[PDB]
């Protein structure tokens, strides 16, 4: 080879070897990932080098935690990561369709064809499939029942039915509760918290906020029944001047005077807070809660506790916006313009203790625009799995709201596109008909895999499914408990339109780019 004569330590794979390597890697990935698809898929256990345990079924986690050092695997993993971070679902189908496309392409390439013909066929088939998908979709009003169906369909594929029924209502309620009829949905306004006890069927939604820290002074009250809330990020610790400074005294009395005088700056702010509290909560009937993003000295803590104030220090930055949205106050960086209009209201504040950890609950807000999902369970891996499922469900519901349309599922759409493309292909001129046929056969992988996982015969089941949808123009999918054809829309199986669109685009682009590689070379520095 030319490269070897210049760099004897280089590695190279030429025309046919490169294609063989790429096809082999893609098939190897899909052979492992094909067992995740559908609600009937099995669970994989992953153990790291540190000894941790992770039970999972999601495609992205499996891809990024399975031990592999292949370049094609790296490319496919990057594509799956982009899919995940944009849409939130469809990671496994990406790999399945890419692998099937490469296999079907190699099937015809092995008989002397050139990859460019299959590439043109792929492009034409993609255009036709997008045109068909644009018309197959169903536009609805996106009411609570439709959202419940979509969320249940998206969540049933990760956990069992008993927990999925619990999670669906919480996810839908949170999404609806943080929604206004404009200004597209902004996450980070739903907080995910996990507490390790009280088995997962106790996972709930709180119309308020939960903070993972509590009061630090022993004498502070543990429960407030009607609370004014102050939110701030001003510092109540001792502060040193920016320029270098030092005290020069002459006697012990002067030292005492200086010691007393070095605290007035913070004592002034504490006095301002105390005066506002006494102005607002005249009698001992209400309560006062302070949340600060910065530290609080023990002297300030004692001064506040002497008047019945519940103070929390060093909260996180996003809680500054969350508390404002929920309670309805103003986050302020100075006490120069303090007034009751800067306060918020909360109907209940209390505290819980879990051994070495402490939690604070703010509850009974009037009209909260921010809520919290409280995850519970007896295992760290259980909590992680539930967190991933909740992410999936929230993303699915948000995408369903953002789009005006939803699509029938369970392979009906794949069957319909295959049928349409088969009839379209005679119109094409040349040998691109082979590429169109390969694209259709690749699209027919999802119902096959679903039937295989459910435990039926792939060929017979697909033949029955295609036997229907041709004598009746209905959209027909696979029933996973009987193997018979069914109608997805009537049963209640739904899928996202944006997910399918993105999946088609990404799979076609990656397959086309992979098929055109001429050689693989490693000739740089080691």
């Amino acid at each position: 080879a030319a490269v070897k004569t210049l760099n004897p330590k280089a590695e190279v794979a030429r025309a046919q070897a490169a294609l063989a390597v790429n096809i082999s890697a893609a098939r190897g990935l899909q052979d492992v990932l094909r067992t995740n698809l559908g609600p009937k898929g099995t669970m994989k256990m992953l153990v790291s080098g540190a000894g941790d345990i992770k039970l999972t079924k999601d495609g992205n986690v499996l891809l990024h935690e399975m031990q592999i050092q292949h370049p094609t695997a790296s490319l496919i993993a990057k594509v799956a990561t982009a899919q995940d971070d944009i849409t939130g679902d469809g990671t496994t189908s990406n790999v399945l369709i890419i692998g099937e496309l490469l296999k079907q392409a190699d099937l015809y390439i092995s008989e002397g064809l050139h990859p460019r013909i299959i590439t043109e066929g792929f492009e034409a088939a993609k255009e036709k499939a997008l045109q068909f998908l644009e018309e197959v979709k169903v536009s609805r009003e996106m009411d609570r029942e439709t959202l419940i169906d979509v969320a249940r369909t998206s969540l049933r594929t990760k956990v069992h039915a008993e927990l999925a029924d619990v999670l669906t209502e919480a996810v839908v309620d949170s999404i609806l509760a943080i929604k206004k009829q404009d200004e597209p949905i902004d996450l980070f306004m739903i907080e995910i918290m996990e507490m390790k006890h009280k088995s997962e069927t106790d996972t709930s939604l709180i119309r308020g906020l939960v903070l993972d820290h509590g009061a630090r002074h022993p004498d502070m009250k543990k429960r407030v029944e009607d609370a004014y809330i102050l939110t701030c990020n001003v510092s109540l610790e001792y502060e040193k001047t920016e320029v270098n400074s030092g005290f020069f005294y002459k006697s012990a009395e002067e030292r005492e005077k200086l010691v007393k005088a070095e605290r007035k700056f913070i004592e002034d702010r504490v006095k301002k807070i105390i005066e506002l509290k006494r102005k607002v909560c005249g009698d001992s009937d209400k309560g006062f809660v302070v949340i600060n993003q910065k530290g609080i000295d023990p002297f300030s803590l004692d001064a506040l506790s002497k008047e019945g104030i519940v103070a929390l220090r060093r909260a996180k930055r996003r809680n500054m916006e969350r508390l404002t949205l929920a309670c309805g106050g103003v986050a302020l960086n100075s006490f120069d313009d303090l007034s009751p209009d800067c306060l918020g209201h909360a109907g209940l504040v209390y505290e819980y203790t879990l051994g070495e950890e402490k939690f604070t609950f703010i509850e009974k807000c009037n009209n909260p625009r921010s809520v919290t999902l409280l995850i519970k369970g007896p295992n760290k891996h259980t909590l992680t799995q539930i967190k991933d499922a909740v992410r999936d469900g929230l993303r699915a519901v948000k995408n369903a709201i953002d789009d005006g349309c939803v699509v029938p599922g369970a392979g009906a759409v794949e069957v319909a596109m295959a049928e349409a493309l088969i009839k379209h292909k005679p119109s094409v001129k040349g040998r691109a008909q082979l590429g169109v046929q390969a694209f259709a056969d690749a699209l027919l992988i999802i119902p096959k895999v679903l039937a295989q996982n459910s435990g039926f015969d792939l060929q017979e089941t697909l033949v029955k499914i295609q036997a229907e949808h041709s004598e009746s123009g209905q959209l027909v999918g696979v029933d996973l408990n009987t193997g018979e054809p069914m109608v997805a829309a009537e049963v209640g199986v739904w899928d996202n339109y944006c997910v399918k669109k993105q999946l088609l685009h990404s799979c076609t682009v990656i397959a086309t780019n992979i098929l055109l590689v001429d050689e693989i070379m490693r000739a740089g520095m080691s």
């Binding site: 190897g28 669970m43 000894g51 592999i68 006890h197």
Partner: protein, 529 residues
């Protein structure tokens, strides 16, 4: 010869040192073996007749105990399935505090029984659904067996009789004495409100005489020494400070600057006079003893000795809070004479010696107080640690009794009744889940079987007699330990009871762990680092 090169695909793309197991033969049947072996490891430490076990950890520290949680914590496990079982046991210990061996026995039995169903043909899903149905039925059945609920949690004899069993399961012979001690200690600090904090019972160990010389004290003891000349006070008014017992200085860097000689000659005299004034101002309020959390100065100690003030320095940042709770004082972050509300009151404060140990004692006559302490005397640190663990289990049992008042019979009666009723229910269910339900029912005999084996009798005769006597309608009959011939005894009359909540949580967690282990299909391990 020739070689089998590799399989194309994942087998070639796998990293070096990684492991990939798949299928029933390579994953499930090995996980069941690991869990069964782990259960067999600790099976022999169950019941009153359980034998102690000696474990040395990686730091050459010696443990002697028969507590399942401690044994599992000190062992180091490399197998993930046993790791999940261990976490289930630890969660049970955190939630209740007793029943950490029942979980292991139940999970091992459930898995070893599901193995033969998988062998004869049933799939994993049908086993899982049967187990879940059986668990729900067991939780429904359980309340009807409740008998002899707790009546008064402020009666010493009733509390001792309720707490006897959970201590007798670890210290066979000393259970009466330990129950009396723990009952006194727990009843002392139980408020009017139901709130009972476990942390309010302190344990102090002094090397010396035998266990029978242990005692309970209404107050606090510290293994410290008095810093001053005064050693005893007969009616103590206590001041508590968090700052060091010294003249304070600026937070910013300071410097004494002098331009004449009079200032140089007067500085130290002024400082000494100021310190004397502060100390006398503190002493004028009537304080006898000053407790500080930080450094003391020589001049401050000199003046405190001059004015007859007892000075004690304790330093944990938590012992100070506990002492404040005990006496009724509030820690002061600045050195100022206290106000009456900030002033604590204790009857006796003194320094004593027990078995080559100098201690400082704050003692009350009040039978309630705020906290109490248990002083243990033993001839070996390991023995004292074991007695400490028994005391902890007794305290946890008292707290659980505070949470819920219901009791159920023990020594196998509840398990036999549950097994019989679950078998009767599973007889009438048509389908392929009846086998799983019957196996779940059969798994309950492992507890009486283990008790009989540890006792040293024939388990088959014990189980047959239990079934025969339960067929006549006697729901409170269980294994007899004292007899040398396998026999049965009425548990309600003998007072062998145990809490309802513990059984509930144990069954729930064991079933969840078993089904979670059964749900795994294939395993991917990275190389250890």
């Amino acid at each position: 010869a020739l070689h089998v090169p590799k399989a194309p695909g994942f087998a070639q793309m796998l990293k070096e040192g990684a492991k990939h197991f798949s299928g029933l033969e390579e994953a499930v049947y090995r996980n069941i073996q690991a869990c069964k072996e782990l259960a067999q490891t600790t099976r022999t430490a169950y019941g009153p007749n359980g034998m102690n076990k000696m474990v040395i950890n990686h730091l050459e520290k010696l443990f002697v105990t028969n507590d399942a949680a401690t044994i599992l914590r000190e062992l180091e496990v490399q197998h993930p399935a046993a790791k999940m079982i261990v976490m289930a046991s630890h969660m049970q210990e955190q939630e209740v505090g007793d029943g950490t061996n029942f979980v292991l026995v139940f999970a091992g039995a459930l898995l070893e029984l599901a193995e033969e169903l998988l062998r004869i043909g049933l799939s994993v899903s049908e086993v899982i659904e049967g187990y879940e149905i059986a668990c729900r039925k067991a939780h429904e059945i359980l309340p009807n067996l409740v008998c002899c609920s707790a009546k008064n949690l402020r009666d010493i004899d009733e509390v001792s009789s309720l707490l006897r069993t959970s201590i007798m399961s670890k210290q066979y012979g000393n259970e009466v004495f330990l129950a009396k001690l723990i009952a006194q200690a727990c009843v002392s600090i139980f408020p009017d409100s139901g709130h009972f904090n476990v942390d309010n019972i302190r344990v102090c160990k002094i090397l010396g005489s035998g266990i029978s010389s242990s005692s309970v004290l209404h107050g606090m003891v510290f293994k410290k020494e008095t810093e001053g000349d005064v050693t005893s006070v007969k009616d103590a008014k206590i001041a508590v400070y968090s700052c060091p017992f010294d003249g304070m200085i600026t937070e910013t860097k300071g410097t004494v600057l002098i331009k004449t000689a009079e200032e140089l000659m007067n500085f130290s005299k002024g400082e000494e006079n100021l310190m004397d004034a502060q100390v006398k101002a503190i002493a004028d309020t009537g304080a006898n003893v000053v407790v500080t959390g930080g450094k003391v100065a020589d001049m401050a100690l000199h003046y405190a000795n001059k004015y007859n003030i007892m000075l004690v320095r304790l330093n944990s940042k938590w012992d100070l809070r506990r002492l404040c709770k005990t006496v009724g004082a509030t820690a002061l972050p600045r050195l100022t004479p206290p106000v009456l509300e900030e002033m604590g009151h204790c009857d006796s404060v003194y320094l004593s010696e027990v078995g080559d140990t100098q201690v400082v004692v704050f003692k009350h006559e009040k039978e309630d107080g705020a906290i109490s302490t248990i002083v243990l005397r033993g001839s070996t640190d390991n023995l004292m640690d074991d007695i400490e663990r028994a005391v902890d289990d007794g305290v946890n049992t008292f707290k659980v009794l505070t949470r819920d008042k219901r009791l159920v019979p023990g020594g196998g009666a509840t398990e036999i009744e549950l097994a019989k009723q679950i078998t009767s229910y599973g007889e009438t269910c048509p389908g392929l889940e009846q086998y799983a339900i019957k196996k779940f029912a059969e798994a309950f005999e492992a507890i009486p079987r283990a008790l009989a084996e540890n006792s040293g009798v024939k388990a088959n005769e014990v189980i047959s007699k239990l079934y025969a006597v339960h067929q006549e309608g006697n729901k409170n009959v269980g294994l007899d330990i004292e007899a040398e011939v396998p026999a049965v005894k009425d548990m309600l009359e003998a007072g062998i009871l145990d809490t309802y909540l513990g059984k509930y949580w144990a069954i729930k967690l064991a079933t969840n762990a078993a089904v979670t282990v059964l749900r795994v299909d294939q395993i991917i391990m990275a190389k250890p680092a």
